[PDB]
Amino acid sequence: LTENPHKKADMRRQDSRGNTVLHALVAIADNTRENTKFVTKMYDLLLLKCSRLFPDSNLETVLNNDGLSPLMMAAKTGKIGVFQHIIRREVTDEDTRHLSRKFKDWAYGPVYSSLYDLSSLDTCGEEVSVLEILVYNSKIENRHEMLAVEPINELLRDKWRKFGAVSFYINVVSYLCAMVIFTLTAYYQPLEGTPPYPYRTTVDYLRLAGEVITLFTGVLFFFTSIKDLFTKKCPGVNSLFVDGSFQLLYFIYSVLVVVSAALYLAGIEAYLAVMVFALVLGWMNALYFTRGLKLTGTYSIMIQKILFKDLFRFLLVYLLFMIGYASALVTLLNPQSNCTVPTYPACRDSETFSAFLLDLFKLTIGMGDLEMLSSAKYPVVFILLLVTYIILTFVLLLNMLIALMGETVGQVSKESKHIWKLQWATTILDIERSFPVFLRKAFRSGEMVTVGKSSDGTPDRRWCFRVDEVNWS
Amino acid sequence: YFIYSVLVVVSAALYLAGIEAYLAVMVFALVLGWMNALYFTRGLKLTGTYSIMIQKILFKDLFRFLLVYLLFMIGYASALVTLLNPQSNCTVPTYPACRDSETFSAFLLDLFKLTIGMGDLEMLSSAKYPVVFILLLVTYIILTFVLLLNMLIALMGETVGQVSKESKHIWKLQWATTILDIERSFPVFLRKAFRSGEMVTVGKSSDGTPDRRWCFRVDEVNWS
């Protein structure tokens, strides 16, 4: 069909969706052996033939309707085999060599400085990159394995060692200082609100400085949040972190600080109670930090699961069980003042509000001891029921929780450090996205023209990343 | 060992002086002394792995973990004392709030710290501002208990799956260090060395020591 003497079938032609031969050839691929083998082979065949027929342009650049590319499409759909091959492709014959990725720079015996061309793994935000799609997008299926292909891992390492790690510590220490100052300014708040204008003495000036710096940090965080919200890469592929993860925490924090500032100007009693509330949420944010280096505590994953996972419904059913027992036993025990804060301890069905006696019995059982021995007072059915309650509660809770411990410890495997690596990559990339990347802080460049010229991404300079290796072959 | 000796010597000096409140390092010396006993028991009989833990926990993730825990709890203490801040009451600390009595932050801070550490005794009272305080404190206690237990037990699992043959490798390294510093302590070249062997010709060579070539014979059995 490529060289039929009759009407030709130009490879560059694309369907209604825009998926040309390579987009579709990636759409059918999988992560198996035979499928990846033949898809990679035929991808190479098609690309080389199309380049030979039209050396003017590279076939792989023809975007679909969504604007992606075969490499980007394999990244977004989660195709490890095609992605690995297309990111480690080198072609020998010169007429079709310009469409390679893993150039060779120099060798000095057993040392090879392999120059991977990341012309399209990072665009400084100009056009969507394979790293952003790969890591920010949480709907990928093979996110880790693809994030460790070869140029990606070393690229993240290099970013870490260059405005990736220093800036992270700077930001974490700055946020910790902001939280400390928030704590101090709330604690040293003028007694019972009463927001005066007394800033004349040294300690008062210090308090004013703390308040103003706290407000400045809050407004800066809100500015960051709104900038992130407005900045959308593509409909469907975007952070969309509202009501998810932890961006909502920063948003809520800023909202609370602003509301508190308003009511502080008003100076109203029982309304600064959100100030302190802000603070608690503030320090919960510190828990979502410590996701960088040094094998950080895995709290995140647990709090990321326990928030909306089996433990939630488990504690819900536990509350239902205990409250059902509370109703059962208060009904059983329901049948002069006694000088007690709750109305009566039963006393021939005194009753009042269910919550009162319910909480009485709830705290009694939670504390556990103090017994109820008395004398006679109806048969042993009550003590029998309560002893089954305590025995089943203690035994089942301990056994199930400890078996869950075993399950999670056998489940917190290399998958856990995969989460750590993903968090580290997200930290690096949102650090870069925060400040202008295209400044003179990017990834290394390479050859200018001819041997290292091609129309794959960026001018003939072909911004390339060199990774060293040693092979005894 | 250096610190132990320094403390003993300083204490001997002040004992000659005989000054009050200065022999407190004597007892201090003793505590450190017995901590040295922990670094012993690194020889035979599958000694307790205390060392590795104390060798890690001293300057590893647990240190910063407890540091951030202290920061979290103290932040909560400041939050809740600020919330609760608003006749003598005969109490060792000045007042339990009592309309913003205040004095020194450490006083009320330690009051609330020990109250939370002990945990019980509640604070029920009546009315006294809305449920936001009790809500916050119940979140504190729930997250504290649940997260600490779950993370500590998961760390237990991680270390037990990590205390592998690598652990007995540490044991063997400690055993080797014990043997070698024992030898280095006293003159080794005395008649306590490792066996000798052939003298000349077949067992002569200029690799180390005279043609005697101090050699170590290891027996083996091979059915070949």
Author numbering:
A (entry chain A): 304 to 638, 649 to 786
B (entry chain B): 553 to 638, 649 to 786
Give excerpts from the publication:
The transient receptor potential vanilloid 4 (TRPV4) channel is a polymodal receptor that is activated by warm temperature, osmolarity changes, and many ligands. Like other members in the TRPV family, TRPV4 is critically involved in a plethora of physiological processes like temperature sensation, osmoregulation, and mechanotransduction. To understand how the TRPV4 channel is activated and inhibited by ligands and to facilitate drug development targeting this channel in the future, we have resolved the structures of mouse TRPV4 in the apo state (mTRPV4apo, 3.6 Å), in complex with the agonist GSK1016790A (GSK101) (mTRPV4GSK101, 3.6 Å), in complex with both GSK101 and ruthenium red (RR) (mTRPV4GSK101_RR, 3.7 Å) and in complex with Agonist-1 and RR (mTRPV4Agonist1_RR, 3.9 Å) states by cryo-electron microscopy (cryo-EM). In summary, we have identified the cytosol-facing cavity in the S1 to S4 bundle as a hot spot for GSK101 and Agonist-1 binding in TRPV4.
